[PDB]
Amino acid sequence: SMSVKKPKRDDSKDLALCSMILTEMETHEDAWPFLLPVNLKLVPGYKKVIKKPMDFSTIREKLSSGQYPNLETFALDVRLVFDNCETFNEDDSDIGRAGHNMRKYFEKKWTDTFK
Numbered sequence: 001s002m003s004v005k006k007p008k009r010d011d012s013k014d015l016a017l018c019s020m021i022l023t024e025m026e027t028h029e030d031a032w033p034f035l036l037p038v039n040l041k042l043v044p045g046y047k048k049v050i051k052k053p054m055d056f057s058t059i060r061e062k063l064s065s066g067q068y069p070n071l072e073t074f075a076l077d078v079r080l081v082f083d084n085c086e087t088f089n090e091d092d093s094d095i096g097r098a099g100h101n102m103r104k105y106f107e108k109k110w111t112d113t114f115k
Contacts, residue, residue, distance in 0.1 A: 018063060026060075031102065059081070085099030
């Protein structure tokens with residue numbers, strides 16, 4: 001509350017560390033469905049159904065331009081990518097399995113880097 005604060009967690013490395021995680025997600029062999037925005041002209045149903053499209057290149061540009069106010073807003077966009085994938089793709093598809101795998105990979109890096 002006013003003039004009452006918990007001890008200050010050092011957040012000075014968060015930007016660098018989120019960038020490193022994102023590099024590791026970019027270079028994973030199962031990243032291919034997520035590297036670029038889904039083409040809304042060429043994929044029937046996507047525009048109407050997926051209310052907030054998100055992809056790694058869009059996260060990278062937001063990251064690079066100071067559009068994440070803190071590390072939690074960064075995690076929310078990463079998770080959005082996988083939540084969108086589960087909304088549109090069957091679990092038993094190459095893209096559906098890709099999404100589950102990447103989400104796992106991300107959540108471990110996130111815990112190991114920050115928790």
